[PDB]
Design a protein around this ligand. Structure first.
Ligand SMILES: O=N[O-]
Ligand SMILES: O=N[O-]
Ligand SMILES: O=N[O-]
Ligand SMILES: [Cu+2]
Ligand SMILES: [Cu+2]
Ligand SMILES: [Cu+2]
Ligand SMILES: [Cu+2]
Ligand SMILES: [Cu+2]
Ligand SMILES: [Cu+2]
Lengths: 333, 333, 333
């Protein structure tokens, strides 16, 4: 009887950051309440000034990471303000029934709805907008995120022993298909409806123009680099709603990886690179052992370094010469 | 001594349906006999009327699913009637030797052959035509299917306990490369030989024009939707002979998934989406818990909803509000 | 104290062959010393005479396979002779820190460096050149290879029992993006710098022009076919530094496969085809049971048979009619 369970209201945070939560559940099952507001907005995605009409959950690409525990109830209030122009909804891959919620959450501008579902399966899952006849257009305009359903006793390794992360980050990888003129320049539009017909043609090539983390080329670099220290245990959650990716931490590894993201499965160990299929979220656990700059990339290196799928970690601490050292520095023969 | 084993003649059925068989073997090893007739035919693949010269096993794309048990002998009679125009053969990925049978099964129009092989490995496997110098052309004209080799004691879960399906369906996913004129319209040809030179150029782009289940856009929709009831255990076998796919059941999950399709391996649990590599068959097991319409898709959503890789399940039974419910229906703020 | 460990100098061999080594370690941890010389050179990659400016470790594409044991130290001397024109470095996916070594190994023409790192994780790993701002260009010009870190007690199966190979081969799969004129002919250049600007445009299409094993179309065919005998246990190591592949042995299987190549994980059994993600090395173990010619392919069959990703095995021994036999040879109906 859902009437009698405890409730908790959670306020979401902007990716790559994740809202506060407990790894090991301290309470019994709860109704966890979230609110998202849909926001259509112009977004600049590269250094040359390319602009698109992004379609967002809560103003970000990706939308925010939600965190609950197995057998919690997720109650989402979804608001589509009358400043928007399109119909939207939400499909949770974590949910059972009604196209993941999409059939029950159709809201025109000016409408809201509240959905509840039971988180019966632990893992990281994609959520995304999926309106009938316009699914890939909404998804590839940035209208996707992820939800994590932790086991009630937290993460465990391949031998059933506890794994505990010190930091968690969320990297949402987005494939964009920006329309082009005859010469190859990107087009601009005053409204999303205006872009629709060209967008469909651009999607059919199956060749993205940009592939980005956190909504833009270089978004997770410079001062927006991810941070950690030597000895810290980091969980990196990574989603791709539409297209396969192959993450890789340059200078590191995935010590424990759930590539398809479902925690009842034992993790893969010692991965250099792993495949996250389009429509899936994965998680990798790593303990940093060396300081410095790491790159975190889709290891199609054209996708990484030419089209934008590359971020950084800045890691502090002491260098360990036993793991690696320069015996003879670059010099003349 | 093969002379002394029992024999059984099996008559194949049209996909997505599967011929009758036992899950748990009731007899010892047998010689299981199948006959396939090759058929080159015009096929209409989309709603706009696009036409190709399909190359088929038994008149369908995909060719039919064969079902045997580990350590059975498969004896296939393969007939290439003189109404066809090309040389064909068959390569079973389930078989050991002679390029999977391809080197022993070359039949010109007007010829037949009979191959026997031992099913030494349990799993779902691709079979396809593979004539020397023309392999991708035959495969991508629809000349592929699958065979399932069940363990003698049936399917089992990750803990070694029996899994029993109530219904089984076969979804053969096909990538097509239809040649185009300068403006982008699809070309028509009077014969397959006539299409050959353009077909090779269209294949080299690596960009399909259509990706379909069961041979056509919308083939598994409307009245040809797959059916089940709440509480039924369904096995979905899925093959792709040429190209990676990532199936996903919208509103559901793969409770137990053998993504690369080999049953000596434990299944992956609770998958939202899984990768079936090109040249592979996979199987997913799901117990339906909610009624309604489900979509079954390749979760590259451009491939699904723009190029044709999308089917439906119509599921009957009672809605369960504990799993999902609309708390506040879409309405004005 | 590294001062006190034994050292051994290893001389590398040309792929697909692998330098001599022990499977089960006979000594304790050692410092294993390797030398590679960088070599920029013209390479002919197809039968039509297409030419590129390859960038190589030790004169081959791929660069040679290095073999060590878990907790050995790898000491690489890397030489960039003044006959070369570009800056190069090396990133080992096996290594921890400093972008896999890349930040410590930058050598201009005329320079050398020596790096040491500890092989803390068993598996097959990619290594590749990765100079800042030019990473995909170097990688897709052929500047990648692999290293194998064997467990100290060798390979084991899914039940922890020893697996021992009789032969090992290394297949390095390379995606090339050769620039084209308006009509589709491949361009030639006098120097690598000269090709740079066109190369970047050709890479951005994400569509390779050639995909090859061992540096050329048909390189592992004819007299350069891989060899084995019925009853021999073969380990095939396969790397792709940039792009997903799906190997398959036509007429065989992967009896034990580490698709993502990390040996602390149990292998997958009985694979027909398996996915090696771009940026990864994998290994497959197979015991040959039938003689004859086998093809070893990327099972995107367009990539295999049109773009070049296809090699052969020539296997000697006696045919086994129990596994496969032609009951009725192709003949007239
Ligand atoms: O080793 N990273 O490309
Ligand atoms: O959740 N299906 O796209
Ligand atoms: O069965 N090989 O394509
Ligand atoms: Cu939307
Ligand atoms: Cu989805
Ligand atoms: Cu054929
Ligand atoms: Cu095949
Ligand atoms: Cu280089
Ligand atoms: Cu790398």
């Amino acid at each position: 009887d859902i009437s009698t369970l405890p409730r908790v209201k959670v306020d979401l945070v902007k990716p790559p950051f994740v809202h506060a939560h407990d790894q090991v559940a301290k309470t019994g099952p709860r109704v966890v309440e979230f609110t998202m507001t849909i926001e259509e907005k112009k977004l600049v995605i590269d250094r040359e000034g390319t602009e698109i009409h992004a379609m967002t959950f809560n103003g970000s690409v990706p939308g925010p990471l939600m965190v609950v525990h197995e057998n919690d109830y997720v109650e989402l209030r979804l608001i589509n303000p009358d400043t928007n122009t399109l119909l939207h909804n939400i499909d949770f891959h974590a949910a059972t029934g009604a196209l993941g919620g999409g059939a029950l959450t159709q809201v025109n501008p000016g409408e809201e709805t509240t959905l509840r579902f039971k988180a019966t399966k632990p893992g990281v899952f994609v959520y995304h907008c999926a309106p009938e006849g316009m699914v890939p257009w909404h998804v590839t305009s940035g209208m996707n995120g992820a939800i994590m359903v932790l086991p009630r006793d937290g993460l465990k390794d391949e031998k059933g022993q506890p794994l505990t992360y010190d930091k968690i980050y969320y990297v949402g990888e987005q494939d964009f298909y920006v329309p082009k003129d005859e010469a190859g320049n990107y087009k601009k539009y005053e409204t999303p409806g205006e872009a629709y017909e060209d967008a469909v043609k651009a999607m059919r090539t199956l060749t993205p123009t940009h592939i980005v983390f956190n909504g833009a080329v270089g978004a997770l670099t410079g001062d927006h680099a991810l941070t950690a220290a030597v000895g810290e245990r980091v969980l990196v959650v990574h989603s791709q709603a539409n297209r396969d990716t192959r993450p890789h931490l340059i200078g590191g590894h995935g010590d424990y990886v759930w590539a398809t993201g479902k925690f009842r499965n034992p993790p893969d160990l010692d991965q250099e690179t792993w495949l996250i299929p389009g429509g899936t979220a994965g998680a990798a656990f790593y303990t940093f052992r060396q300081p410095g700059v790491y790159a975190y990339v889709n290891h199609n290196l054209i996708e990484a370094f030419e089209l934008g799928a590359a971020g950084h970690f800045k890691v502090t601490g002491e260098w360990n010469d036993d793991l690696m050292t320069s015996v003879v520095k670059p010099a003349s023969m």
